[model samples]
Target: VKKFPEGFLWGVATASYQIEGSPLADGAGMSIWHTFSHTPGNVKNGDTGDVACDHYNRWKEDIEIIEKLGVKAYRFSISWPRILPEGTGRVNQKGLDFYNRIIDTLLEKGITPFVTIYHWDLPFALQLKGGWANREIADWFAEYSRVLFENFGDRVKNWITLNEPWVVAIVGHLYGVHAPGMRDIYVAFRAVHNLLRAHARAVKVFRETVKDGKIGIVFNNGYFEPASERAVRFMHQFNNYPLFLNPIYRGDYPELVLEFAREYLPENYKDDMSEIQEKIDFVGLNYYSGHLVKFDPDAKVSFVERDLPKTAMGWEIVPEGIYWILKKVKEEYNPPEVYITENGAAFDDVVSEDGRVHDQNRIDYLKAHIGQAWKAIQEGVPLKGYFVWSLLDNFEWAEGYSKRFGIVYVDYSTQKRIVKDSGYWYSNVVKNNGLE
Candidate 1:
């Protein structure tokens, strides 16, 4: 059959800071991304999200594009600092109203809003108080989540609690590359444990606050080559997914991660597996590029460059990785349901005098990956939906505007969005609900 299962959700995704431009407009607070980008050395080319796609003001037009694309779902995140300027108190009505308006527009256009409560845009104020490193942040996250569920849960039945906790913990704290940067691996471990606590707390609050809604966390997965039981378990599974999923599914961190993080795993942290494993409604997998991994001495993991075609970001394009990870998650953890919450590629895009971007590379990238997803479904994996990595090209963290992941191309200088070839190809996929 060329068609996907009935009721499959065809969608696109974007994070808050990545697409929305107005950082502190109308009484909103500063996010760690704002602080990081504004710093001279934090981002490449000194780029900031000051006016990213101007989505804050131009959301109506963006929604128009999504509605026209014929996708049933739109996954965008909420800026935490936008509502709770201080991270936990004093609601900003204007910030709340901004999203309220966007949500209403999406529903009116007959599109579902798959709301991600947090996508690494922590309130800057929270960082000033130790941020994810402190256990107290769990309560703060729960409090922040309550505000969202109270207001948006009426229409937003699908909710993702956190996007890529491992990235948040490792990249930001250990590598010191991203926002609230710190260079201590111990802090990274601390941050991850606290993130799990936060996830569990937020899921608890979701049940109490929303009458009818599903809530889960999104994990960014990169399947390693060889697909060896050892490599897959260490490089892909234990390294990232287990910290988040093991608690929910297996009641504790895997023995592999715990031992590796042995001394690096800080002191006096109690693991309340009960609260941490609150039985989430579903799991969201953000499948991107994969790697050829091997054992290394320094950090114990090394990814080598393969001869395969790569994205502009230099990530190896392994479409089958998506299928492998899908089967792995289904067989390993067995979450109630699954969604390809973020998947796509960034390519060099050039707009011709014809006033359109011929992004055939990105289109082909999607075709191959979505085909893998379809194969996974045929094999009885409980895959429910697929959302392209982004709907518009905007702020891409430290990479700045250099990388474009959006199916809908955004001309940063003029803020004019042109639906690229990939966008059109994807629109038809959504219309037909199949890959043919």
Candidate 2:
């Protein structure tokens, strides 16, 4: 590997809900994720984030871990419910004090801070009143964002407005895999438009109110390719790109996704489109694995999910998909600097007999995807930074701690931090400025 630019940032990313275990403690209100994961059969193995990693109570210790890694930046999200218990209207000073302390600690340790506004922890109270499905969420999200930036923007330079609105809409609303679990296609599409609009609206506020901060949206744009040799499967593969991803990046719904959810559109789409396309500074790509797509003409308009060949979490290992998605985004929107906001894979990580995990699989997974990222950059993709999926294996969302995607391993039984061999390897990569 070649030396990256001298000032390039190499960091790890994490979200609040996944790590900060105290769901309703500290006067924090309930979030949809808390609700979904706690419900029976919603999460695998009946896992809930009620006490994932206890990072909520372990701030200085966590920052210490970051310092030991010798990384320059730490990308993390603020829990909206923790700040505004009811989503909007009332301010929770306890929540503010916690993050304030954490951010200050990161700065004191010489780590640059990157803040993500939302990471699917929508206040359950807001959902009871109508969550992203209602247009009002645009303004509500904007208010929350304003409060965060107003308090912390001076210290935080990079601001990601929203992380993976696609998952919020598709998994949470349409497929019922995530929070506020509703499986209505019509609601899913509407919720997606509203989330993007909210992102654009928050970004607009950031540009107007915050002078020195750079604002962008973090989208988990998963890559896909066709499995079958059939021309129809190729077509489905092509269509699925726009169906799942392009709408948020391109500011318009895909023709096929629209057709699939045509029955769900309300009468006021034109008015909504204007808000959805607000100009953004950059588009953050949160990639994980690639997929082999196959179009089924005889099936319904929407394609069905298929099993992958192999993955610790059943995610296909197709690194080229990252290149494909990057190329497509560059061609379609011509957006500004792109960043690999989140990229990593989960595996059945177990502690080896030596008391250190030999996660060679994780090292290889990161190498391949990162090589693909470098390929795109060499082809003039204007890529800036890459944030590994996590700094530590705190929590794995619906999968809980069962699947680990961290360089630093955590023993939930003991709440001990174990820097896997992969962590040492990645630290060297960052220190030397690139992978071997």
Q: List per-prediction Cα lDDT, in the order shown.
A: 0.89, 0.79
- In model 1, which residue pairs have backbone atoms overlapping below 3 Å? none
The list of candidate 2 runs beyond 4 A from truth reads: 228-251, 298-309
lDDT of 1: 0.89
Error of 1 at 38 (Å): 1.3
Q: Pick the lDDT winner.
A: 1
The TM-score leader among the candidates is 1
**Worst lDDT 10-window in candidate 2:** 231-240
Per-model TM against the reference = 0.97, 0.93
lDDT of 1 at 115: 92
Clash count list over all predictions: 0, 2
The reply for model 1, stretches above 4 Å from the true place, is 226-232, 266-270
Residue-level lDDT of model 1, residues 235-322, one tens digit each, is 6655556667987887777777876785776564445667887889889998888888777676677777789899999999999989
Native-to-model Cα distance after best TM-score fit, residue 133 in candidate 1, in Å = 0.5
lDDT of 2 by residue, 98-160 (tens): 999989999999898889899888999999987989989989999999999888887888898
Clashing pairs in 2: 225-293, 233-295
